[PDB]
């Protein structure tokens, strides 16, 4: 009953949100085998190597390293001799901070010293330790790439064994390095691509939403497996998966969609439904611009229609407030006695509000020399978007609609 739902909710939330390690690996057998073999070579012997892993963000770059480390550290007492250092390009943005983090992680601050002294020969002269470098591309943007060059030098030296691992999303990481470090860099690269077909993606989805064998209740787990297997071949679920697979093959988006689907699981509906997946996909695939347009007012709609008319008459040219005001006046003057008797300040405030929502952006920004009036403004919307949004507008009057059609 309720306890089983709470437990399965906790387990799946841990699986998706925190991305807890799992024994299941997809299409990465050769890459993981190579990486584990080289890690074992670097650990059981004094040899040093340098490897870079390239892949799109959200493709489980960290998972391969974590699984390999969990597999190989606990082999023998080598982990006692093995030391690991983790560096992220976001937290450590300066070489001083990187050096401080390296010293603190090694518990050598007592040996090296506590003060802010810039000397690093305490470690350099003394220098198996493994290095993990998250966002390796950021380190290449430092002033002189001193840390990377020193790491490559000590890797190429015959003093101590050092393993260097870097993570990069850019495919041009080879040209972001200087000639010296590129020459001293051992050209070991591993590429993480989603090289699998749609049926394999369906298998991945079926396995991911499958309860583990360690769940207490076994008959409920078997019924859940039957439900997910039955939901696997449903053509609506397949259509949603096909759409999301056409959009992107990254597993992070699939995890997000599965998490959002599981949110609508209550006591009255212990097992999911294809309509739940349809609702989740619909919620995940809405455009923000149309939503913003829907929440506007009548005056803003009229101003936007005038803006579209300006863009149509003057092909791809900027504009200001005065022309828009003049042609809005033209529109309200052609009509005999429509209730739109508004003064200048309210229209000016409406234009300011529209500019605040960042639907209109200035060109070659300057202030003081040019007022808000007589300022070159441009629209950031498409005509078809305006037509579609106006079609779904709840209470659009006939007059403004016909003006828009004109």
């Amino acid at each position: 009953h309720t306890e089983c739902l709470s437990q399965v909710q906790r387990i799946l939330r841990e699986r998706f949100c925190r991305q807890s390690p799992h024994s299941n690996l997809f299409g990465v057998q050769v890459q993981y085998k190579h990486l584990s073999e080289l890690l074992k070579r670097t650990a059981l012997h004094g040899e040093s190597n340098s490897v870079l892993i390239i892949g799109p963000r959200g493709s489980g770059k960290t998972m391969l390293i974590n699984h390999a480390l969990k597999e190989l550290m606990e082999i023998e007492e080598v982990s006692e001799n093995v030391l690991q250092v983790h560096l992220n390009g976001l937290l450590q943005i300066n070489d001083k901070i990187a050096l401080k983090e390296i010293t603190r992680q090694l518990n050598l601050e007592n040996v090296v010293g506590d003060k802010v002294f810039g000397s690093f020969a305490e470690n350099l002269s003394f220098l198996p330790v493994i290095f993990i470098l998250d966002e390796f591309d950021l380190f290449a943007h430092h002033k002189n790439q001193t840390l990377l060059y020193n790491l490559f030098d000590i890797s190429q030296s015959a003093q101590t064994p050092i393993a260097v691992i870097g993570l990069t999303c850019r495919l041009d990481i080879l040209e972001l390095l200087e000639k010296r470090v590129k020459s001293r860099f051992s050209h070991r690269q591993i590429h993480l691509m989603n090289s699998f077909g749609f049926p394999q993606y369906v298998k991945i989805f079926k396995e991911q939403l499958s309860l583990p064998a360690e769940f207490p209740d076994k008959v409920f787990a078997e019924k859940w497996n039957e439900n997910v297997q039955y939901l696997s071949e449903d053509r609506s679920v397949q259509e949603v998966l096909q759409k999301h697979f056409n959009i992107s093959k990254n597993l992070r988006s699939l995890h997000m969609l599965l998490m959002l689907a599981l949110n609508r699981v209550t006591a009255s509906h212990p097992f999911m439904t294809a309509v739940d997946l349809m609702e989740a996909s619909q919620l995940c695939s809405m455009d923000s611009k149309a939503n913003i347009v829907h929440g506007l007012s009548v005056l803003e709609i009229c101003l936007i229609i005038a803006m579209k008319h300006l863009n149509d008459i003057y092909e791809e040219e900027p504009f200001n407030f005065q022309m828009v005001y003049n042609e809005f006046q033209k529109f309200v003057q052609r009509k005999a006695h429509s209730v739109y008797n508004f003064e200048k300040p309210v229209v000016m405030k409406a234009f300011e509000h529209l500019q605040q929502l960042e639907l209109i952006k200035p060109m070659e920004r300057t202030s003081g020399n040019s007022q808000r009036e007589y300022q070159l403004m441009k629209l950031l919307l498409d005509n078809t978007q305006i037509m579609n949004a106006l079609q779904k507008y709840p209470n659009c009057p006939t007059d403004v609609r016909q003006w828009a059609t004109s």
Binding site: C17, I93, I97, C169, K289, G295, N369
Partner: protein, 364 residues
Amino acid sequence: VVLCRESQVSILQSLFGERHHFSFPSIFIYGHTASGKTYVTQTLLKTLELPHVFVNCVECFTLRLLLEQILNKLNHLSEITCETFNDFVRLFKQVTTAENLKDQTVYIVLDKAEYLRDMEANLLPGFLRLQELADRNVTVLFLSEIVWEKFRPNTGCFEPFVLYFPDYSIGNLQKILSHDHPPEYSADFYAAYINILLGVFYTVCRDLKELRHLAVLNFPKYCEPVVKGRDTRKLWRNIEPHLKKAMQTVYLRELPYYSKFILIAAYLASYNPARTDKRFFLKHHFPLDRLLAILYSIVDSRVAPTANIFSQITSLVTLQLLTLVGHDDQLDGPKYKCTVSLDFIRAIARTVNFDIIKYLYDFL
């Protein structure tokens, strides 16, 4: 209390689950100005009695102030000063080990997040992936009016869950406005007030705060006629002109002699091309010298070049009526522009008995 807000409340309650449970690393909430994001989120957090820190991005205009305020408020919930993001992460790991912070989700409420993209490049990616770095059951919320499309960094980061707060309607606004009726009169009286007010001003003013402010301002004149002695026609007839007078300001809430001539000459110089200058001033057929020549032409009396006119020029520059364009060190070829509205210059011309329209080349 919240009215007509039950779908989002239920969604958030389902998302939160239990205290020991985990949740999304980042949720991005966007909506309109009067959507009530702050009200709804803070009322929900107070009702659920959860550990939450409320932070204003505007007040914390510096990174050190932001981090120190967050850490100090968290410590008060459970002096500390930090300078760098890595030190902040380490201290956050140190401070979150409290028993009250052991098996509970930590919520960091941020509002007016539109300024975060202008603070630092890596601050937003660091905040987005806080749950991975800290690994301490931490959730961060965002409140903004700009869509997520403009918050995306160039390198790409962990995508937050996007959420939208629904826009209000006639019935929704009427319910909200009629909830807080004055106790000194009937509910139907205030309901009729809200009805007529909505029928008048919904076309332009959809802001709940502004419409409520207008109602508060105009209610005493609504209630005067009945005090003077349920007459709908009487009330509407007595009250209609005041409503028209009020709608004139929805969002709104004597120079010296030679100064007027300087101002009109500056306007003429700004809005008249130089090619037509002699056509308007030469008896037979912008830089400072052009202004001087035009001023000498306009004034019927011979004006001496006393330093006081230069002082008037500089004072007019100070009063933001004339804008200096050229370099400040270049006070031999200065450039000026006039920022006075056409109606203002027409009004000031009338008090002088001068017809500026006859000299404006654009109108001719």
